[PDB]
Amino acid sequence: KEEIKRLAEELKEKTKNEEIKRLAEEAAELAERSDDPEVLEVVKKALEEALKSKNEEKIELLLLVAVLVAEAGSVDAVEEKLEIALLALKLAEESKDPRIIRGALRAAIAALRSDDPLALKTVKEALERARASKDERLIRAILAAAYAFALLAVAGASAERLKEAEAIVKELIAAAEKGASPQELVLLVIEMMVKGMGVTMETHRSGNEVKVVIKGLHESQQEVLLEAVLFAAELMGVRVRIRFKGDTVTIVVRE
Amino acid sequence: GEEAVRRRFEELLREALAFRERTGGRRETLEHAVRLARELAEFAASHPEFNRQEAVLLAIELMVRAMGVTMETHRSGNEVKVVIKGLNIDEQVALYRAVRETSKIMGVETEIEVEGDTQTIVVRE
């Protein structure tokens, strides 16, 4: 019903996040132009859950759902995208590791914000393998790959370059399931970012550490490389030292 | 000429500390903080009299005071190196986002080293 309007304002007078305030207004402003029972119920559930959440990742993903279902008018028109969001929310409730909860929701948000079906498919199947395996070490490795790959897609990377990035996502998961060390997995995340940007890298092994020199990275690319590596290194517990000098990023992975 | 930039810095600083009390959301206070660093750089650029380097330092201090971290400023020769400690992964990428953007609006080169909770920024001009 038009209780949506009430649930939306309630969040709008409660929010401290400006974008959350915008989505709540947008979700209610697209739902009253619909007579589909599913749409009015999906937005109702979404606004209700986000009204009872203190985690900004959940609130944003729930509102991003309600806007995605209210605009399409049909739940079937976004039923794929709807699944990826309902999988991360389920995984978020299943785990007790705050890095896993943040990694699952952020990867779903980034995948939904990105318009690429390859990212949607990848994150979906990455969440399914995470929910299937009850191994937290494997789940963190899967999310470090998926959330990184999603950041490439939301950065507007070419579909020809996301193809080469996905091959490294597959390689990273396969290596993780064979008990690869966290340093090896962090190196492969960097390998994914580099191949997802049309760039080359140089590796050096001065001792039990790896030095990676990346050349010709644009300013908008260096930000998202920093965000993906820092998140994967925090998931794996790896210490990385990243240096930004001109157009050359130097990452030192230490174990 | 410089009094205008300092007065604007003081107004964005008290707005940063006002949102620091709320802590309504973790990334929200960070995106609000980098926007404030952006408004200061775009303001100092409108006063070409003001030191382009000192503008970047002010925007960095704005970010430090917004996130509640600590800062140490080392001045040697013409370059200035700030060492910021106590950053999490989200504050790390946000501080980098503000420095990279204010360094451009002001036309300044920066060298940034991220390691753990510490970000070391060299401002040269």
Numbering used by the authors:
A (entry chain A): 3 to 257
B (entry chain B): 0 to 124
Wording from the paper:
We use a switchable target binder (host) and a flexible effector that can rapidly bind to and switch the target–host complex to induce a large steric clash with the target, forming a strained excited ternary complex. We show here that by explicitly considering excited intermediate states when designing coupled protein systems, a broad range of facilitated dissociation systems can be designed.
The unbound structures show an open hydrophobic cleft in the new designed state X poised to bind the effector, and the effector-bound structures show that binding the effector causes the two switch domains to register-shift into the designed state Y. Structures of the target–AS1 complex show that the target binds as designed (top), with some strain suggested by small variations among the structures (bottom).
